[PDB]
């Protein structure tokens, strides 16, 4: 899939779907995640837990209640078991697949940055860049980064 990089705030992305890199436990937290509870709503939360806990690496789909998305796809990063590239590699392959399987075209991602706190940057970039990649061009993948000179620093490394 093809990825172009802008400045933004992920909840204001208008399109079929966000990712949202989780727990596994889908409980939502600071951060984007946050943004995410606040601006889409408690119904986002309700349905993580109805849905219940998941595999580090796994995905799950919820609503966006109030974003002008359709579906938070989030995607387990850490948990139960600790944040790893290998967490990080599948949770954003297995996120892409259920885009995939949902007939979506437009997916919007956020760097991650806040989660893999121990990882190192470039190495991150590389395996979730390979994943992106890889997924059908079906999708068109938005990254969606706060500042202008970030975005376009992404950018210019492709």
Same mark, same amino acid.
């Given at each position: +899939?093809?990825?172009? =990089?802008v400045?933004?705030?992920?909840?204001?992305?208008?399109?079929?779907?966000?990712?949202?890199?989780?727990?596994?436990?889908?409980?939502?937290?600071?951060?984007?995640?946050?943004?995410? %509870?606040?601006?889409?709503?408690p119904?986002?939360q309700? $349905?993580?837990?109805r849905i219940g806990?998941?595999?580090v690496? $796994?995905?799950?789909?919820?609503?966006?209640?109030?974003?002008p998305?359709?579906?938070v796809?989030?995607?387990?990063? %850490?948990?139960?078991?600790?944040?790893? %590239?290998?967490?990080?590699?599948? +949770?954003?392959?297995?996120?892409l $697949?259920?885009?995939?399987?949902?007939? %979506?075209?437009?997916?919007?991602?956020?760097?991650?940055?806040a989660?893999?706190?121990?990882?190192p940057?470039?190495?991150? =970039?590389?395996?979730?860049?390979? *994943?992106?990649?890889?997924?059908?061009?079906?999708?068109?993948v938005?990254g969606? =980064?706060?500042?202008?000179?970030?975005? *376009?620093?992404?950018?210019r490394?492709s």
């Amino acid at each position: +899939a093809r990825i172009r =990089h802008v400045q933004g705030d992920i909840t204001e992305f208008q399109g079929d779907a966000i990712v949202n890199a989780a727990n596994n436990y889908l409980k939502l937290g600071a951060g984007v995640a946050g943004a995410i %509870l606040r601006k889409g709503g408690p119904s986002i939360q309700e $349905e993580c837990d109805r849905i219940g806990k998941i595999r580090v690496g $796994e995905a799950a789909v919820t609503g966006a209640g109030n974003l002008p998305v359709r579906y938070v796809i989030h995607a387990a990063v %850490l948990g139960d078991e600790p944040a790893s %590239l290998e967490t990080v590699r599948k +949770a954003t392959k297995s996120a892409l $697949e259920k885009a995939v399987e949902l007939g %979506l075209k437009t997916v919007a991602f956020t760097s991650w940055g806040a989660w893999v706190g121990g990882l190192p940057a470039e190495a991150v =970039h590389r395996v979730m860049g390979e *994943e992106i990649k890889k997924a059908p061009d079906t999708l068109e993948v938005t990254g969606v =980064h706060g500042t202008e000179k970030s975005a *376009e620093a992404y950018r210019r490394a492709s």
